[PDB]
Point group: C2
Chain length 246, copies 2
């Protein structure tokens, strides 16, 4: 199983700051055949980011439309992304669920669109603090995964992300034990719906306050296959988070 370190830049960056950050990223020597390292810039920053990044870095966009080509103002379809050779897409991110009415149904329609246009999908899910405190974590996770999991045909092409909503941008990282326990359950859901071989090859990443100090102990866990990094991926020390997966 190949590790997967993703940089979700979110709504951040200038042409110059990206030039500077992309320069520090390029200095890191890593084998792209052994490790996947993906950068997700803002849509309008993509060409600039792709030009500057060495080919060892994979690239993608932070959102993809549930609709194909047509009368949908403001949307980036899956077929448009494929034409531009954009390899990866993020689907079901907490912030889009929270601020932009993105539901479990939107998630699967985005996945189905991405898969039939041969795009690789990074699919996000996680429970809130209330759901955690009500002991509903697995119930919520199972519900969120089952929404889309049947669509997966190639299990190298779909990458799952457990992002506990209370851990995102708060500094309250889930302990490598807490993350591992949910990751192990996620892999069990994939096993019982898709098969053991399909479960053993799918990457399940952790998202939620990954930094340079906690990344090593997180990646060491048997069912954690990498990270979706937010704030720390905006920093030059993001190379050290990639180093933890080497």
């Amino acid at each position: 199983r190949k590790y997967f370190v993703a940089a979700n830049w979110k709504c951040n960056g200038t042409l110059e700051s990206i030039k500077s950050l992309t320069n520090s990223f390029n200095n890191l020597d890593f084998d792209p055949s052994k490790l996947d390292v993906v950068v997700f810039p803002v849509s309008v920053h993509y060409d600039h980011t792709r030009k500057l990044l060495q080919s060892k870095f994979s690239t993608g966009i932070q959102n993809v439309s549930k609709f194909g080509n047509g009368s949908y103002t403001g949307e980036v379809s899956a077929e448009i992304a494929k034409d531009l050779n954009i390899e990866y897409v993020i689907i079901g991110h907490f912030e889009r669920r929270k601020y932009f009415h993105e539901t479990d149904e939107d998630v699967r329609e985005k996945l189905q669109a991405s898969l039939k246009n041969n795009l690789k999908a990074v699919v996000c899910f996680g429970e809130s603090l209330e759901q955690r405190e009500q002991n509903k974590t697995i119930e919520v996770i199972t519900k969120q995964v089952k929404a889309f999991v049947d669509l997966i045909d190639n299990f190298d092409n779909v990458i799952l992300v457990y992002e506990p909503l209370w851990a995102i941008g708060t500094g309250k990282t889930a302990t490598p034990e807490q993350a591992q326990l949910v990751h192990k359950e996620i892999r069990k859901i994939v096993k019982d719906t898709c098969g053991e071989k399909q479960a053993n090859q799918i990457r399940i990443l952790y998202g939620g306050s990954v930094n340079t100090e906690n990344c090593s102990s997180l990646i060491q866990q048997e069912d954690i296959d990498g990270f979706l990094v937010g704030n720390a991926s905006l920093k030059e020390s993001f190379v050290d988070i990639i180093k933890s997966a080497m």
Copy 2:
């Protein structure tokens, strides 16, 4: 009043089709000081489109964020647009109101963010068939315009678009006289809220299946200052629509 013809490509285009479309667009000789011609490609096509089109053509994006920079995955902020020197933005388009929960509040906050970052805004609104059949057109138009109109500090930099919802992508073009009556009322709404000189300065465009056949009859109305064009702007014959406003 300087006429304004806008191409809304929506969720359409490949690299090769844009190359072919921009090449035919570039052949049309027009004076950008006499007429504003703006094209709005998909966010991921922006750099490609901007490079291909000659400097006489203005460009913009189909949507801007209500949020500034920060943890908002999938968003394009007004600060980011400013840094790319993206001149124009579309706000409040019917499709984003219909499919993506965009409200009058979102429209207000997007316009405020755009003007703060020195972007020019193409702001869309319009009544549905049911609202028109209930004779609520003036009431709905007034409510939609009043949601944002007080934010306008420069009346060359904000451009209004009347989108009768039943006319969008349907071939149900509102008759020149029907459109004129609304445009005239929109100008009066801008008169009572912003002043007379500002009302006579602001551009109000028609949006609703404009083509090469109906464009000249629409542009000839005294209160219609141009168009936001959908599907017809994906054709090489879009140059003839520009010609009717020359």
